[PDB]
Amino acid sequence: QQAGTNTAENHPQLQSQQCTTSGGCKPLSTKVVLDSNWRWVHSTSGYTNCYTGNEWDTSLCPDGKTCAANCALDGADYSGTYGITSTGTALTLKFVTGSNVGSRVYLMADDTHYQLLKLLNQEFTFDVDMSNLPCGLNGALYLSAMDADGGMSKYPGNKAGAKYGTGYCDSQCPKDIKFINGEANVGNWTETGSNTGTGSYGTCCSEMDIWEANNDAAAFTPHPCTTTGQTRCSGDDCARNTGLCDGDGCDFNSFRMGDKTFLGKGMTVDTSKPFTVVTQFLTNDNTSTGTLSEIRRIYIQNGKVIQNSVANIPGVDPVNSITDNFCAQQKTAFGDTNWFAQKGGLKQMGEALGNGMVLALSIWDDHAANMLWLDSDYPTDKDPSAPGVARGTCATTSGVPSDVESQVPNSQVVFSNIKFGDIGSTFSGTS
Ligand SMILES: OC[C@H]1O[C@@H](O[C@H]2[C@H](O)[C@@H](O)[C@H](O)O[C@@H]2CO)[C@H](O)[C@@H](O)[C@@H]1O
Ligand SMILES: *[C@@H]1O[C@H](CO)[C@@H](O)[C@H](O)[C@H]1NC(C)=O
């Protein structure tokens, strides 16, 4: 896609801190950028849309390469159109704004490069307020193995780059992405909703889901893929789980793992109020060249340090971190296949972390599964009593997008105090 000039692109500031054991924390003047899927796409010579609603203009966009040459991404009114605002250290993402639903932004080092995070033997910390984020919604903070320039160097057809939020990929190999590899994804375009559709290609890469949550339930989940970096897929390579990527991941949700009173309204981690979330990525030898061996989670609320809940499921060791062993045991007890290990488990996840990943923040509803996999019983054809089926207390009729968009459109999530660096250095303790 080309870079449009009808609307200036001014990225909101979102400061983060980089931390070391000896030096403490130092601020970075990072920014955020709206993902390309949400932007206005129009002819490079004017104001005519290349895409409107859920369909492309066949005149401007007869094939992918022609479309990418004729069509430009333009600047965005972050607050006005998309309900995205920043204080400079806290990002608020609103659910419905006019006819817009949800958003996704990326953390930027400067105006043309995403911030590349290398988190092996490191930790990531942030604060979250989910008081106004109910059943059926997801406020997510995650890492994807995207290129720092949004694909510009690899794909001549992409002249927009990270400045316009290009180059998404994730472990679900999504085919709903409009531009992939510098070409419009217009082949066999099929409508899937009022403003969405899918094309013949998907875009896949490894993903680390640090936080997917609402005030009823939370999960953190590595998704390794057999490839390295963003890759366009077609046909069976895009199929979920059986293709290049593990779409299911190895998840840790405290309610699913048998502690129904750990996290939620008025619980140990009280989701009615703000709290801090720490995630540490440990290697077998405590160096940044080692193999990823455990992912640990700590919470802090009202100054109390809260260790992660322990698994309480028959056949699963009572542990509170993600390791390859836990993943194998959980996949058995719950009756799911271990696609995670097939793609290479934590070691393959670590190689992606090592190579650097991009941070995404987003608010969304789920057309396919109604977020029931996060906060309800899932899958809907399994006994609500079997281990691994119940993931929260929300009703099985909740999360219908048409419903939540009418019922709770002013829902929002606030992410703040983003910090990363040496293990044990983004937070402290005392007696
Ligand atoms: O696609 C919805 C959701 O799936 C999540 O995986 C589920 C999987 O679908 C289900 O078969 C299994 O029982 O549980 C896992 C974990 O919830 C996946 O982790 C999500 O990213 C995805 O959005
Ligand atoms: C790595 O650090 C952990 C602290 O989490 C410690 O238990 C362990 O002994 C260290 N291992 C090595 C090889 O130093």
Short mmCIF file of C-alpha atoms and ligand atoms in Angstrom, two decimals:
data_model
loop_
_atom_site.label_atom_id
_atom_site.label_comp_id
_atom_site.label_asym_id
_atom_site.label_seq_id
_atom_site.Cartn_x
_atom_site.Cartn_y
_atom_site.Cartn_z
CA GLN A 1 0.00 0.00 0.00
CA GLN A 2 1.04 3.60 -0.61
CA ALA A 3 1.31 6.36 2.04
CA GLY A 4 -1.56 8.82 1.85
CA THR A 5 -1.38 12.51 2.66
CA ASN A 6 -5.00 13.66 3.11
CA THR A 7 -4.76 13.38 6.84
CA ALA A 8 -1.71 13.91 8.93
CA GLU A 9 -0.52 10.90 10.99
CA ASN A 10 0.41 11.99 14.51
CA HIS A 11 1.19 9.00 16.74
CA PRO A 12 0.00 9.38 20.41
CA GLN A 13 2.90 9.34 22.93
CA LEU A 14 3.09 6.40 25.34
CA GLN A 15 6.19 6.48 27.47
CA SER A 16 7.76 3.18 28.63
CA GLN A 17 10.68 2.43 30.90
CA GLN A 18 13.72 0.27 30.32
CA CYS A 19 15.18 -1.19 33.60
CA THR A 20 18.46 -2.78 34.74
CA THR A 21 19.54 -4.31 38.01
CA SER A 22 22.22 -1.75 38.67
CA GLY A 23 20.89 1.37 36.96
CA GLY A 24 17.21 1.28 37.81
CA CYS A 25 14.56 2.41 35.40
CA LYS A 26 15.04 4.96 32.57
CA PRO A 27 12.19 6.37 30.45
CA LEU A 28 11.87 5.90 26.65
CA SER A 29 9.82 8.25 24.48
CA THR A 30 7.84 5.58 22.76
CA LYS A 31 4.61 6.12 20.80
CA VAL A 32 1.68 4.10 19.48
CA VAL A 33 0.32 3.50 15.97
CA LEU A 34 -3.08 2.24 14.74
CA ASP A 35 -3.01 -1.05 12.82
CA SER A 36 -3.49 -0.69 8.99
CA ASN A 37 -6.73 -2.73 8.95
CA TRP A 38 -8.60 0.02 10.67
CA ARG A 39 -7.56 2.86 8.34
CA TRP A 40 -9.16 4.64 5.42
CA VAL A 41 -7.89 3.18 2.14
CA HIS A 42 -8.26 5.46 -0.87
CA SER A 43 -6.95 6.17 -4.35
CA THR A 44 -3.42 7.70 -4.41
CA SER A 45 -4.68 10.42 -6.63
CA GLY A 46 -7.65 11.64 -4.55
CA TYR A 47 -10.40 10.75 -2.05
CA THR A 48 -12.16 7.80 -3.69
CA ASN A 49 -12.31 4.73 -1.49
CA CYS A 50 -10.48 1.50 -2.50
CA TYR A 51 -12.41 -0.30 0.27
CA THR A 52 -15.83 0.56 1.71
CA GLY A 53 -17.79 -1.46 4.23
CA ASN A 54 -16.75 -5.03 3.55
CA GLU A 55 -15.86 -4.86 -0.15
CA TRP A 56 -13.08 -3.58 -2.44
CA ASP A 57 -13.50 -1.32 -5.51
CA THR A 58 -13.03 -3.67 -8.49
CA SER A 59 -11.93 -0.83 -10.74
CA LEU A 60 -9.02 0.33 -8.54
CA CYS A 61 -8.31 -3.12 -7.24
CA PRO A 62 -8.58 -5.79 -9.86
CA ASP A 63 -5.62 -7.87 -8.50
CA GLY A 64 -3.38 -7.48 -5.44
CA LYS A 65 -0.41 -5.78 -7.05
CA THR A 66 -2.54 -3.27 -8.97
CA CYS A 67 -4.47 -2.38 -5.80
CA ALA A 68 -1.30 -1.81 -3.75
CA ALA A 69 -0.03 0.57 -6.45
CA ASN A 70 -3.30 2.46 -6.73
CA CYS A 71 -4.25 2.59 -3.06
CA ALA A 72 -3.01 4.47 -0.06
CA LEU A 73 -3.39 4.23 3.74
CA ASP A 74 -4.09 7.51 5.44
CA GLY A 75 -3.73 9.21 8.79
CA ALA A 76 -6.14 8.67 11.66
CA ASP A 77 -8.16 10.80 14.20
CA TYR A 78 -7.16 8.58 17.17
CA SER A 79 -9.69 9.86 19.70
CA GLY A 80 -12.44 11.00 17.40
CA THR A 81 -12.74 8.02 15.15
CA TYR A 82 -11.25 5.22 17.16
CA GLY A 83 -11.65 6.12 20.86
CA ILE A 84 -7.94 5.84 21.49
CA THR A 85 -6.41 8.31 23.89
CA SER A 86 -3.19 8.64 25.85
CA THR A 87 -2.15 10.67 28.87
CA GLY A 88 1.48 10.13 27.87
CA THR A 89 1.90 7.15 30.22
CA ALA A 90 -1.66 5.55 30.20
CA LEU A 91 -3.49 4.35 27.10
CA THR A 92 -7.29 4.13 27.09
CA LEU A 93 -8.92 2.03 24.38
CA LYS A 94 -12.70 2.43 24.03
CA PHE A 95 -14.83 -0.32 22.54
CA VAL A 96 -17.43 1.40 20.24
CA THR A 97 -16.95 4.85 18.73
CA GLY A 98 -19.61 5.79 16.22
CA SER A 99 -19.56 2.97 13.67
CA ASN A 100 -16.07 1.85 14.67
CA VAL A 101 -15.67 -1.27 16.82
CA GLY A 102 -12.44 -1.89 18.69
CA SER A 103 -8.85 -1.12 17.88
CA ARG A 104 -5.31 -2.43 17.78
CA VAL A 105 -2.15 -0.34 18.18
CA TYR A 106 1.58 -1.11 18.17
CA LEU A 107 4.37 0.34 20.34
CA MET A 108 6.83 2.51 18.27
CA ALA A 109 10.43 3.45 18.89
CA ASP A 110 10.11 6.44 16.57
CA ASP A 111 7.77 7.51 13.78
CA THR A 112 8.86 4.85 11.27
CA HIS A 113 9.96 1.83 13.37
CA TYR A 114 8.19 -0.40 15.79
CA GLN A 115 9.91 -0.91 19.15
CA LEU A 116 11.68 -4.30 18.97
CA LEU A 117 11.54 -6.05 22.32
CA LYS A 118 14.04 -8.84 23.16
CA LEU A 119 12.67 -10.44 26.25
CA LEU A 120 14.67 -13.62 26.77
CA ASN A 121 16.04 -13.54 30.35
CA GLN A 122 14.04 -10.42 30.87
CA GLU A 123 10.67 -9.32 32.32
CA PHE A 124 7.74 -7.23 31.10
CA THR A 125 5.47 -5.31 33.50
CA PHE A 126 2.38 -3.19 33.15
CA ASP A 127 -0.67 -1.88 34.98
CA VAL A 128 -4.23 -2.52 33.87
CA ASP A 129 -7.68 -1.23 34.84
CA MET A 130 -10.52 -3.54 33.73
CA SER A 131 -13.26 -2.11 35.95
CA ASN A 132 -15.19 -1.14 32.81
CA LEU A 133 -14.32 -4.23 30.72
CA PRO A 134 -17.06 -6.86 31.06
CA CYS A 135 -17.98 -10.39 29.84
CA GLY A 136 -17.64 -10.90 26.12
CA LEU A 137 -14.79 -8.36 25.61
CA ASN A 138 -11.00 -8.80 25.56
CA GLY A 139 -8.38 -6.21 26.45
CA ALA A 140 -5.18 -7.76 25.13
CA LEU A 141 -1.45 -6.94 25.37
CA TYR A 142 0.71 -9.26 23.27
CA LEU A 143 3.88 -9.76 21.26
CA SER A 144 4.05 -10.70 17.57
CA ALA A 145 7.12 -11.49 15.43
CA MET A 146 6.52 -8.62 12.98
CA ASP A 147 9.28 -6.79 11.18
CA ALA A 148 10.31 -3.45 12.69
CA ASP A 149 9.59 -1.54 9.46
CA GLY A 150 6.22 -3.22 8.88
CA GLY A 151 7.69 -5.18 5.91
CA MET A 152 8.95 -2.23 3.87
CA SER A 153 12.39 -3.69 3.15
CA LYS A 154 11.08 -7.05 2.05
CA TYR A 155 8.13 -5.96 -0.02
CA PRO A 156 8.45 -3.29 -2.70
CA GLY A 157 4.66 -2.92 -2.85
CA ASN A 158 4.54 -1.56 0.71
CA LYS A 159 5.56 2.07 0.78
CA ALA A 160 3.56 2.84 3.99
CA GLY A 161 5.39 0.75 6.59
CA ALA A 162 5.31 0.95 10.38
CA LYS A 163 4.21 4.59 10.22
CA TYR A 164 0.77 3.34 9.05
CA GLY A 165 0.68 0.15 11.13
CA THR A 166 1.47 -2.40 8.31
CA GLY A 167 2.84 -5.93 8.52
CA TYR A 168 0.60 -7.68 11.12
CA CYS A 169 0.94 -11.43 11.62
CA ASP A 170 -0.13 -13.81 14.39
CA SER A 171 -0.48 -17.43 15.26
CA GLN A 172 -3.97 -17.79 13.88
CA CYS A 173 -2.63 -17.00 10.31
CA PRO A 174 -5.51 -14.52 9.84
CA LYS A 175 -6.89 -14.09 6.34
CA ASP A 176 -8.87 -10.94 7.23
CA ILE A 177 -5.81 -8.68 6.84
CA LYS A 178 -6.08 -6.31 3.90
CA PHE A 179 -2.48 -5.87 2.90
CA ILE A 180 0.05 -8.73 3.10
CA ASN A 181 3.55 -8.78 1.60
CA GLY A 182 2.86 -5.42 -0.09
CA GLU A 183 -0.17 -6.71 -1.97
CA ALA A 184 -3.90 -6.25 -1.33
CA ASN A 185 -5.44 -9.53 -0.15
CA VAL A 186 -8.25 -9.29 -2.68
CA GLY A 187 -8.29 -12.85 -4.06
CA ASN A 188 -11.56 -14.58 -3.52
CA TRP A 189 -12.60 -11.89 -1.21
CA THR A 190 -15.47 -13.05 1.01
CA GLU A 191 -17.55 -10.93 3.34
CA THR A 192 -17.63 -12.02 6.99
CA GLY A 193 -19.39 -9.12 8.57
CA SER A 194 -20.52 -5.58 7.98
CA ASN A 195 -16.99 -4.15 7.81
CA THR A 196 -14.88 -7.25 7.46
CA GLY A 197 -13.91 -9.94 5.01
CA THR A 198 -11.23 -12.45 4.10
CA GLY A 199 -8.92 -13.05 1.17
CA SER A 200 -6.96 -16.00 -0.18
CA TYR A 201 -3.80 -15.40 1.82
CA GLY A 202 -3.07 -15.36 5.56
CA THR A 203 -0.19 -13.93 7.52
CA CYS A 204 1.47 -16.08 10.19
CA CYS A 205 4.07 -15.69 12.87
CA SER A 206 4.83 -16.73 16.46
CA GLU A 207 3.00 -14.77 19.19
CA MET A 208 3.31 -14.42 22.93
CA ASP A 209 -0.03 -13.48 24.55
CA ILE A 210 1.10 -11.78 27.72
CA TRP A 211 -2.46 -10.75 28.65
CA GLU A 212 -5.88 -11.53 27.31
CA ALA A 213 -8.58 -10.61 29.76
CA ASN A 214 -11.76 -9.02 31.04
CA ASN A 215 -13.00 -8.37 34.62
CA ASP A 216 -14.25 -12.05 34.74
CA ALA A 217 -11.17 -14.02 33.50
CA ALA A 218 -7.59 -13.77 32.28
CA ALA A 219 -5.16 -15.94 30.32
CA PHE A 220 -1.51 -15.82 29.24
CA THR A 221 -0.39 -17.98 26.36
CA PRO A 222 2.69 -18.66 24.19
CA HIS A 223 1.97 -19.64 20.49
CA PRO A 224 5.05 -20.93 18.69
CA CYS A 225 5.18 -21.35 14.89
CA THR A 226 7.52 -23.43 12.80
CA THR A 227 8.59 -20.44 10.78
CA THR A 228 10.77 -17.51 11.49
CA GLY A 229 9.21 -14.12 11.12
CA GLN A 230 6.19 -12.97 9.20
CA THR A 231 5.21 -15.39 6.42
CA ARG A 232 2.31 -15.25 3.97
CA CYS A 233 0.40 -18.60 3.78
CA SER A 234 -2.08 -20.08 1.42
CA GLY A 235 -4.17 -23.24 1.53
CA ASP A 236 -3.38 -25.82 4.18
CA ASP A 237 -0.43 -23.86 5.63
CA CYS A 238 -3.03 -21.44 6.99
CA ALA A 239 -5.12 -24.07 8.73
CA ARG A 240 -5.38 -23.66 12.43
CA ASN A 241 -3.03 -25.91 14.42
CA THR A 242 -2.26 -28.25 11.57
CA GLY A 243 -0.54 -25.63 9.54
CA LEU A 244 2.57 -23.55 10.25
CA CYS A 245 1.40 -22.24 13.64
CA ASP A 246 0.02 -23.37 17.02
CA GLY A 247 -3.27 -21.43 17.33
CA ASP A 248 -4.34 -22.94 20.55
CA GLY A 249 -1.11 -22.24 22.42
CA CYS A 250 -0.29 -23.42 25.95
CA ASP A 251 -2.51 -21.28 28.12
CA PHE A 252 -2.58 -20.54 31.76
CA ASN A 253 -6.01 -19.27 33.02
CA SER A 254 -6.30 -19.54 36.84
CA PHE A 255 -10.08 -20.37 36.77
CA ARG A 256 -9.56 -23.02 34.10
CA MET A 257 -6.72 -24.51 36.07
CA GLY A 258 -8.98 -24.97 39.13
CA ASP A 259 -8.86 -21.85 41.24
CA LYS A 260 -12.23 -20.19 40.85
CA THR A 261 -11.67 -17.52 43.52
CA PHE A 262 -8.18 -16.15 42.56
CA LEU A 263 -9.02 -13.49 39.93
CA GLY A 264 -12.29 -11.57 39.39
CA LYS A 265 -14.48 -8.96 41.11
CA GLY A 266 -13.50 -8.74 44.86
CA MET A 267 -11.17 -11.79 44.58
CA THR A 268 -7.45 -12.12 45.47
CA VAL A 269 -6.64 -10.10 42.35
CA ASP A 270 -9.67 -7.71 42.48
CA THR A 271 -10.56 -6.80 38.88
CA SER A 272 -12.80 -4.06 40.03
CA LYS A 273 -9.65 -2.00 40.70
CA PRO A 274 -6.26 -1.40 38.92
CA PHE A 275 -3.38 -3.83 39.44
CA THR A 276 0.12 -4.59 38.14
CA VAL A 277 0.99 -7.65 36.06
CA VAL A 278 4.64 -8.95 35.94
CA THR A 279 5.75 -11.62 33.43
CA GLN A 280 9.28 -13.09 33.44
CA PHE A 281 10.84 -15.12 30.66
CA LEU A 282 13.49 -17.41 32.23
CA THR A 283 16.16 -19.35 30.34
CA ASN A 284 17.84 -22.59 31.43
CA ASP A 285 21.14 -20.88 32.16
CA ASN A 286 20.07 -17.39 33.04
CA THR A 287 21.57 -15.78 29.97
CA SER A 288 20.02 -14.17 26.92
CA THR A 289 21.39 -17.03 24.71
CA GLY A 290 19.83 -19.77 26.68
CA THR A 291 16.73 -21.79 25.97
CA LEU A 292 13.40 -20.44 27.22
CA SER A 293 12.43 -22.74 30.10
CA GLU A 294 9.71 -21.15 32.21
CA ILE A 295 7.29 -18.21 32.01
CA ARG A 296 6.45 -16.83 35.49
CA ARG A 297 3.66 -14.42 36.57
CA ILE A 298 3.40 -12.19 39.63
CA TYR A 299 0.65 -9.62 40.42
CA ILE A 300 0.82 -6.57 42.63
CA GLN A 301 -2.26 -4.83 44.08
CA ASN A 302 -2.46 -2.27 46.83
CA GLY A 303 1.19 -2.94 47.48
CA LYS A 304 0.61 -6.65 48.14
CA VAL A 305 2.80 -9.04 46.06
CA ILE A 306 0.62 -11.89 44.87
CA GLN A 307 2.09 -15.09 43.50
CA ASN A 308 0.29 -16.80 40.56
CA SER A 309 -2.40 -19.34 41.46
CA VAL A 310 -1.52 -23.05 41.56
CA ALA A 311 -3.00 -25.58 39.13
CA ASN A 312 -5.52 -27.85 40.87
CA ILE A 313 -6.50 -30.47 38.29
CA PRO A 314 -6.10 -34.29 38.53
CA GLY A 315 -3.07 -35.42 36.58
CA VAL A 316 -1.51 -32.03 36.49
CA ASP A 317 1.39 -31.14 38.86
CA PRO A 318 0.38 -28.30 41.20
CA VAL A 319 2.62 -25.57 39.62
CA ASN A 320 2.07 -21.87 38.95
CA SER A 321 4.22 -21.25 35.85
CA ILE A 322 4.32 -22.30 32.27
CA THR A 323 6.89 -24.97 31.41
CA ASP A 324 6.97 -27.68 28.70
CA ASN A 325 5.98 -30.27 31.28
CA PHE A 326 2.98 -28.32 32.47
CA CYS A 327 1.85 -27.93 28.84
CA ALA A 328 2.04 -31.68 28.20
CA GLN A 329 0.15 -32.44 31.36
CA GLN A 330 -2.54 -29.87 30.84
CA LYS A 331 -3.18 -31.00 27.20
CA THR A 332 -3.89 -34.49 28.58
CA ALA A 333 -6.18 -33.69 31.41
CA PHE A 334 -8.22 -31.39 29.28
CA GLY A 335 -8.47 -33.63 26.28
CA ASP A 336 -6.60 -31.34 23.78
CA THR A 337 -3.83 -32.15 21.35
CA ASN A 338 -0.29 -30.76 22.07
CA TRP A 339 0.22 -28.70 18.94
CA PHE A 340 2.44 -26.47 21.05
CA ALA A 341 5.10 -29.14 21.33
CA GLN A 342 4.73 -30.10 17.65
CA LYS A 343 5.76 -26.63 16.63
CA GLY A 344 8.69 -26.71 19.01
CA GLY A 345 7.34 -25.74 22.44
CA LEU A 346 9.07 -23.18 24.59
CA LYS A 347 12.34 -23.56 22.88
CA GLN A 348 10.84 -22.46 19.50
CA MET A 349 8.96 -19.69 21.38
CA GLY A 350 12.29 -18.48 22.78
CA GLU A 351 13.96 -18.23 19.43
CA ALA A 352 11.17 -15.81 18.38
CA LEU A 353 11.60 -13.85 21.58
CA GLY A 354 15.30 -13.71 20.97
CA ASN A 355 14.99 -12.35 17.55
CA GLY A 356 12.78 -9.46 18.79
CA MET A 357 9.06 -8.95 18.80
CA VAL A 358 6.56 -6.05 18.46
CA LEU A 359 4.09 -5.12 21.24
CA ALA A 360 0.40 -4.87 20.38
CA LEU A 361 -2.44 -3.47 22.58
CA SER A 362 -6.05 -4.02 21.62
CA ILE A 363 -9.77 -4.09 22.60
CA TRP A 364 -11.97 -6.43 20.70
CA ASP A 365 -15.07 -8.71 20.54
CA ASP A 366 -15.02 -12.16 18.99
CA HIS A 367 -17.29 -13.01 16.10
CA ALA A 368 -16.24 -16.61 15.89
CA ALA A 369 -16.37 -17.91 19.46
CA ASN A 370 -17.96 -15.13 21.44
CA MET A 371 -15.03 -14.99 23.86
CA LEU A 372 -16.43 -18.07 25.49
CA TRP A 373 -12.92 -19.67 25.41
CA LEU A 374 -11.86 -16.92 27.81
CA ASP A 375 -14.67 -16.48 30.31
CA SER A 376 -17.28 -19.17 29.77
CA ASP A 377 -17.64 -22.84 29.07
CA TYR A 378 -15.85 -23.99 25.96
CA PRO A 379 -16.11 -25.74 23.59
CA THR A 380 -19.91 -25.54 23.62
CA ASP A 381 -20.33 -29.21 22.84
CA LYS A 382 -18.37 -30.55 25.83
CA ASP A 383 -19.70 -31.33 29.26
CA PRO A 384 -19.49 -28.21 31.47
CA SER A 385 -18.27 -30.51 34.22
CA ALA A 386 -15.29 -32.02 32.41
CA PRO A 387 -11.84 -30.61 33.34
CA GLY A 388 -10.78 -27.66 31.23
CA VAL A 389 -14.20 -26.76 29.94
CA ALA A 390 -15.28 -24.00 32.35
CA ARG A 391 -13.03 -20.90 31.99
CA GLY A 392 -15.04 -18.33 33.88
CA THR A 393 -18.47 -17.67 35.21
CA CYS A 394 -19.95 -15.66 32.28
CA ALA A 395 -23.09 -17.16 30.60
CA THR A 396 -22.80 -19.27 27.46
CA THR A 397 -25.08 -16.82 25.65
CA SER A 398 -22.74 -13.89 26.34
CA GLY A 399 -20.25 -12.26 23.98
CA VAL A 400 -22.49 -12.02 20.93
CA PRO A 401 -20.97 -9.05 19.15
CA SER A 402 -24.28 -7.56 18.01
CA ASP A 403 -25.28 -7.75 21.65
CA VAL A 404 -22.27 -6.38 23.46
CA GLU A 405 -21.91 -3.59 20.87
CA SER A 406 -25.48 -2.47 21.74
CA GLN A 407 -25.39 -3.25 25.41
CA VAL A 408 -22.00 -2.00 26.57
CA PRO A 409 -20.52 0.22 23.87
CA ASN A 410 -18.70 2.54 26.34
CA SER A 411 -16.62 -0.37 27.72
CA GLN A 412 -12.90 0.40 27.85
CA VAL A 413 -9.52 -0.81 29.04
CA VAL A 414 -6.60 1.28 30.37
CA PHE A 415 -3.00 0.08 30.08
CA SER A 416 -0.25 1.96 31.88
CA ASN A 417 3.20 2.05 33.42
CA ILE A 418 4.81 -0.14 30.83
CA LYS A 419 8.32 -1.39 31.90
CA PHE A 420 10.75 -3.99 30.67
CA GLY A 421 14.23 -5.11 31.53
CA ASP A 422 16.29 -7.31 33.79
CA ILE A 423 14.51 -9.96 35.86
CA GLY A 424 13.53 -8.52 39.22
CA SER A 425 14.32 -4.95 38.20
CA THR A 426 10.91 -3.64 37.06
CA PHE A 427 9.51 -3.92 40.59
CA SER A 428 10.83 -3.95 44.08
CA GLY A 429 10.00 -5.09 47.54
CA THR A 430 10.64 -4.26 51.10
CA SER A 431 9.89 -5.19 54.70
O1 LIG B 1 -10.07 -19.52 18.68
C1 LIG B 1 -10.54 -19.12 19.93
C2 LIG B 1 -9.40 -19.15 20.94
O2 LIG B 1 -8.94 -20.49 21.03
C3 LIG B 1 -8.01 -20.60 22.13
O3 LIG B 1 -7.74 -21.96 22.25
C4 LIG B 1 -8.65 -22.81 22.89
C5 LIG B 1 -9.13 -23.91 21.91
O4 LIG B 1 -9.93 -23.33 20.92
C6 LIG B 1 -9.93 -24.94 22.65
O5 LIG B 1 -10.05 -26.04 21.76
C7 LIG B 1 -9.16 -25.43 23.86
O6 LIG B 1 -10.04 -26.29 24.56
O7 LIG B 1 -8.77 -24.36 24.70
C8 LIG B 1 -7.92 -23.43 24.05
C9 LIG B 1 -7.52 -22.37 25.08
O8 LIG B 1 -8.59 -21.47 25.36
C10 LIG B 1 -6.70 -19.80 21.84
O9 LIG B 1 -5.68 -19.86 22.89
C11 LIG B 1 -7.12 -18.37 21.56
O10 LIG B 1 -6.02 -17.51 21.18
C12 LIG B 1 -8.20 -18.31 20.53
O11 LIG B 1 -8.59 -16.93 20.39
C1 LIG B 2 19.21 -19.18 37.48
O1 LIG B 2 18.46 -18.33 38.33
C2 LIG B 2 17.56 -18.99 39.17
C3 LIG B 2 16.77 -17.83 39.84
O2 LIG B 2 15.45 -17.83 39.27
C4 LIG B 2 18.35 -19.78 40.23
O3 LIG B 2 17.46 -20.60 40.95
C5 LIG B 2 19.33 -20.71 39.49
O4 LIG B 2 20.21 -21.46 40.34
C6 LIG B 2 20.11 -19.94 38.43
N1 LIG B 2 20.79 -20.97 37.68
C7 LIG B 2 22.03 -20.85 37.38
C8 LIG B 2 22.55 -21.88 36.43
O5 LIG B 2 22.70 -19.97 37.88
#
